[PDB]
Amino acid sequence: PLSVFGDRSTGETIRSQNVMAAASIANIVKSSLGPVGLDKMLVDDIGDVTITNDGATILKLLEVEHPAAKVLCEL
Amino acid sequence: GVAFKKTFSYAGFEMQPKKYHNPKIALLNVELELKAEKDNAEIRVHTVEDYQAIVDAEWNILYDKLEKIHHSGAKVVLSKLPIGDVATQYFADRDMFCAGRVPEE
């Protein structure tokens, strides 16, 4: 009936999806917090290697698709 | 009590009365049909008299089973095995009810 060319998510589904995206982004960098934290070694699929602990660098290097996760990255 | 769907009545079934006020029910597991006596049975005769005797013997076997059922005083006959048209017409002639292929349950 809407006849909108696209996909629509409404209610608890979209809220749970946004929370899943945010939790996934958090879990990406949750292991690099505090002195007992450990670094991550990123590969740019062309052989480039980046070893870092900074959250901003990790989130900028990664390519993110979900927009609620982009919100946390730009945060 | 018990009630079940009608099970593939043969010819002559519609002439049987469909209501009884004190029936006796004969529960049987018997095939009341004209059929071979056994799967491996074989009849060897060399005279037309014996041929006619064999045919009449098959008919008499079926009719003896039917008469034994009838003389028991039962009015409703239910069988787990198929009941042929001959038996159905025989029971209709006696104002009796028949129903073959009744399920186990």
Binding site: - | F8, Y10, K35, D85
Partner: protein, 130 residues
């Protein structure tokens, strides 16, 4: 589908004579008495032949095309069932008529004779037409 070779490649075992002219085929089936052969074609006609004399006794047309033929062995004249149409048809060749029909490829006549299988791509009792 099953066509035996031509020369029979034997030494006159009084069985090399086969007729097998095939003037009609999808359901060629020898009868109880070997004197008659029953065959069917895609024209919707069932043809009965006498193997000895070698001419069509009488053709049966009551159907579209007919596919499967099965015969109940009794003089080869009593009955034969055709299930080619979605119409199982039984014919009597003492009169040449469709004695009974069932509007419902691999029809099989039951050995008892009171029913027959109608496998398509059911046990139909002849005593009740159901």
């Amino acid at each position: 589908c099953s066509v035996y070779p031509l020369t029979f490649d034997k030494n006159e075992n009084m069985a090399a004579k086969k007729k097998s002219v095939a003037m009609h085929l999808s359901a060629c089936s020898f009868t109880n008495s070997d004197m008659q052969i029953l065959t069917a074609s895609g024209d919707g006609t069932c043809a009965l032949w006498d193997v000895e004399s070698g001419q069509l006794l009488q053709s049966f047309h009551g159907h579209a095309d007919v596919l499967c033929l099965d015969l109940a062995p009794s003089e080869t004249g009593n009955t034969f069932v055709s299930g080619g149409d979605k119409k199982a048809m039984v014919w009597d060749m003492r009169s040449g008529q469709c004695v009974q029909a069932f509007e419902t490829n691999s029809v099989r006549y039951y050995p008892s004779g009171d029913a027959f299988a109608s496998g398509s791509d059911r046990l139909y009792d002849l005593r009740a037409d159901r």
